[PDB]
Amino acid sequence: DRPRFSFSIAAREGKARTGTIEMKRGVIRTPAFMPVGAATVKALKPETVRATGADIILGNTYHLMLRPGAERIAKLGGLHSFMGWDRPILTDSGGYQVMSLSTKQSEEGVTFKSRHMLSPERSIEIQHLLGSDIVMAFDECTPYPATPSRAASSMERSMRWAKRSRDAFDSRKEQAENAALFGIQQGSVFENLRQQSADALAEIGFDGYAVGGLAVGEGQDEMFRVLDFSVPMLPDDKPHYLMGVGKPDDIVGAVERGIDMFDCVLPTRSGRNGQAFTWDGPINIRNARFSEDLKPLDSECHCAVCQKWSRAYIHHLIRAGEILGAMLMTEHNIAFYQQLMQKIRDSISEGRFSQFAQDFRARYFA
Template identity: 50%
Template sequence: MEVSIFHLDHRCPETKARTGRIQTGHGEIKTPAFMPVATLGNVKTMKLSDLEDAGVEVIISNTYHLHLRPGEELIKKMGGLHRFMAWRRPIVTDSGGFQAFSLAKIRKIQDDGILFSSHIDGSSHMFTPESVIDIQVALGSDIMMPLDECTPYPVGEGYAEEAVERTKRWAKRAKKHYEKMEEKGLLFGIVQGSTYPHLRKRAVEEIVPLEFHGYAIGGVAVGEPTSLIREISAYTADLLPEDKPRYLMGVGLPEDILFAISSGIDMFDCVIPTRNGRTGTIYTWKGKINIKNSKYREDDKPIDPDCHCYTCRNYSRAYLRHLYTTGELLAGHLGTIHNLYFYMELIREARRHIKYGNFKEWMEDVINSMKGGDDGQGI
């Protein structure tokens, strides 16, 4: 792939953190980047204007779910996913393989692909390396992922090795099929290998020569302890090319994101800020809080007096607690607005401190500060 789509701008002198820019058909993605999850073409409870106000530059949608409902052909007929959901900025789509493994009622892994039954109506479907590319091209994705096999945790070394081999074969087929397409987005490769360093190394050695636009670290945050997630992510990132974006799939706690940034990883996605926003777990610079706790019943302060999100500019903790404890739909909307704004601000500040060369000190201060919250009684 001759054209460079990734430009490195700054490097941290004390860690492996870096800032950069990814060029896509729908604009530039500044890295490090956090991608809110828009599974079915929307970030749950959020309007597009809310995402724009938070500074979201890129979202990630799900091939498995969109294939089942409403179907890629309908979305293509409607002008593609961008037009369908009225989003003008970049969209990443995953392959749907993880959902085919985790959600489908019955699944069978074959050399040709994954045969599975829909978790919605039991209908039979087949994902192959080629069909998954076809679906994502029909959606109009800016960054696509090939079909891979994501192993659970824990998993035996033998099965993890089989998954690495299968993922390699599928990646070759996906790349070959992708190269035949005319109108298409970027294509990343995925590195598997579970918690086995030698399998991670082998996967990198087999996937990188296929020359994808970027590389995703898959098969993490599937049940491992935090220490192991960080160890495997950092180890794998070190093996990946410097001149390509690195994407850590599914890791999303603020502290874990900062650690991954310090390890040289550029892109992240996770449901944590939105899912927790809907249930009342709120993230702040002083740690996370459960806004439903009784101590907020008469608290007239905003969630964070220094936050400029719509929620903090307009509502008190007491009012938010009232909404959550009475089951009002507005609660999840306002909580998600704040959480996503916080995540975007965290990423913006990370980029700024990388640029100015003091990321390590800033990261340590933030992580120490976030040990407060309801658990540390720091709010």
């Protein structure tokens, strides 16, 4: 049987890596894109999510502790059986979404409006009740921009919370034996704080390391600059997860900088809004120029949507507000993202990822 957690690197090119994470509920091919799931990947059955190539999905913790409730999901058998996805699930720790969507912050945790608390201990407990396979430490995503003083204080708190997260996880035998725990690096855009955060997380020890605090308004140039120095600070032999990223070009550049795992609502959310990804760049299917276009969304995509329906039909559906429009757009977009990850993995494996990145950009931004 598979181990609780094993990450193996099969091939490398520069800072880019390709390999596998083996967990009890399945193998995750890296670099990986993880579709974002209120206990559903919006508009898709789990079998459709899997058919697009996804190895792991993300459970929506902040949504789930509010509705339907973590204790309720546990009573019903856990998130996997509740939603019908039997493969790995990664759950965020909830603080980012509390500070984004809900607040009273303290060293103990965060209280927020129905009133609720989240602390490192309660966050880890909720993720256990959901049955998460990859548990995220409870952190604070520092707003951008941040002064050096405030970034330092925030990062220092996150590192204290990272230790509390580790200890809460380890003190729950069933969780420690069956799930994995990732720590989250903070420090805003400042190299010295990113180094201090990486050192603190490595001293505690985690199964994987996320780069937190990015994709919060800084823009791609600055994000890439921070990744340039931040990713090498993390343990090389563990997975690197860039939280909240992102657009196809952001993924390609992040892989060039050593990132192994990605999550974003862009393919799902923007799909329902009419944006379809293609190898020639995104298109907005609502545009009148597609009303009589019999071509599929993308000329090369292997997804079931591009095998069966035209741009003209999907244009009509989205303009009419039809649910099937959201279903088809989302399946195509998630499938496109997975095909992107497959091309990334194969090109690294073949030592031609730098050429792939150049070719991808030349066509995507032509």
